[PDB]
Structure formats: structure tokens, C-alpha cells
Amino acid sequence: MSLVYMNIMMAFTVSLTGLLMYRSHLMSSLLCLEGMMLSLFILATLMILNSHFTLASMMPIILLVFAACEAALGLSLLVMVSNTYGTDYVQNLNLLQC
């Protein structure tokens, strides 16, 4: 296929491995999830505007909505971490090991 799909999928895999490998800090990985949504947005939208299938042009908008509709959810699940502990360090959430 075309040349730009290489680097948009490459940005997806870079954001994938950034999310899927944690650096003991949760906001930096919520950003990696939001970047995966950005890569999915740009990839699907390049395909749709390429093939001129106009009726799925509303599809990335909807996609983008659910992006923030879970990203905000992550922030709502961030503060209950960072009210419980002083930091959002993911190695503090190790109490469910026993």
C-alpha cells in the first residue's frame, strides 16, 4: 500500500509499546492511550478520505468522542489513585497480590 500508512501504523506501534511498557507513572501512559486514539483517527481517516467513502466520514468524529469518553474516564480513575496516595505511581497499586 501507500507510503503514509507505514508511518501512521508506525506511530500506532510506537504508542502501543509506550503504553504497554510502563515507566512507573500513570498520566504518561494515559497520554499513550490518547496517542493510540490519535493514530487510529488519522489512519482510518486517511483510508476513508482516500477511498471517498463519504458516509463513514462521520466515523472518526464518533471515534474521537469515545476517545475522550474513556480518556476523561482515566482521569476520573486517576484522582482516586492520587487522593489515596500522594502520587500516581503504578507500583503503589500492588495491594491485590495477596
Partner 1 sequence: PFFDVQKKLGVDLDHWMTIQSAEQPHRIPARCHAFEKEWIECAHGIGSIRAEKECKIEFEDFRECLLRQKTMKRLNAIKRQRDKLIKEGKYTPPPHHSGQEDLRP
Partner 2 sequence: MNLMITLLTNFTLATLLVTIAFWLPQLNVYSEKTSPYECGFDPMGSARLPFSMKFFLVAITFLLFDLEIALLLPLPWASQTTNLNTMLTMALLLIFLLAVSLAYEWTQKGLEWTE
Partner 3 sequence: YPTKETAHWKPPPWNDVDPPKDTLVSNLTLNFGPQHPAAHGVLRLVMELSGEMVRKCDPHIGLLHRGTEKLIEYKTYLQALPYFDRLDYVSMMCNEQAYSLAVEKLLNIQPPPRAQWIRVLFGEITRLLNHIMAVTTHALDIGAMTPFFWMFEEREKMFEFYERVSGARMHAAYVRPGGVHQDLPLGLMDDIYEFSKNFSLRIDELEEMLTNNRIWRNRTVDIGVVTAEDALNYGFSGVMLRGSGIQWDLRKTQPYD
Ligand X SMILES: CCCCCCCCCCCCCCCCCC(=O)OC[C@H](COP(=O)(O)OCCN)OC(=O)CCCCCCCCCCCCCCCCC
Grid coordinates given for 4: 503514509
Give residue for cell 507513572. Answer: 25
Binding status of residue 13 toward ligand X by CB under 6 A = yes
Binding status of residue 56 toward partner 1 by CB under 8 A = yes
Tell me the C-alpha to C-alpha distance, in Å, between residue 31 and each of 1, 16, 84: 29, 11, 21
Grid coordinates given for 42: 488519522
Site string for partner 3, 67-96 (x = CB under 8 A): -----------------xxx--------x-
CB of 85 to partner 3, least distance (A): 7
Binding status of residue 7 toward ligand X by CB under 6 A = no
CA end-to-end distance (rounded Å), the chain = 50
- Contact residues for partner 3, defined by CB under 8 A: 84-86, 95, 97-98
